[PDB]
């Protein structure tokens, strides 16, 4: 009864000096969802005698 989706974020850049391993930078993420719980109808009745 639900449908979801995910979003990704940025990535940061930084300077490096020669001969070292720079630290990492995180990337955030999030989600969005939709629900379906209700239905609608329209109904009509016709009598046989009134139809003929």
């Amino acid at each position: 009864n639900t449908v979801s989706n995910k979003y990704l974020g940025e990535t940061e850049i930084q300077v490096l000096a020669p001969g070292q391993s720079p630290a990492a930078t995180p990337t955030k993420a999030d989600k969005n969802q939709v629900v379906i719980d209700t239905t609608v109808i329209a109904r009509n009745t016709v009598a046989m005698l009134h139809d003929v």
Binding site: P18, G19, Q20, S21
Partner: protein, 51 residues
Amino acid sequence: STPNVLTNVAVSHSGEVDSLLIEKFNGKVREQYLKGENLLSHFQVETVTGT
């Protein structure tokens, strides 16, 4: 973990010169942009030699 002793070649052992690099030249030389108006063409210009 890290080397920390780099075999950098651009540094002089003696320390007299800052760098051993040669500073290549791209081959461009610039002057001003001034251009001749050529404005004397309109007028009559006679040459005076005797006087």
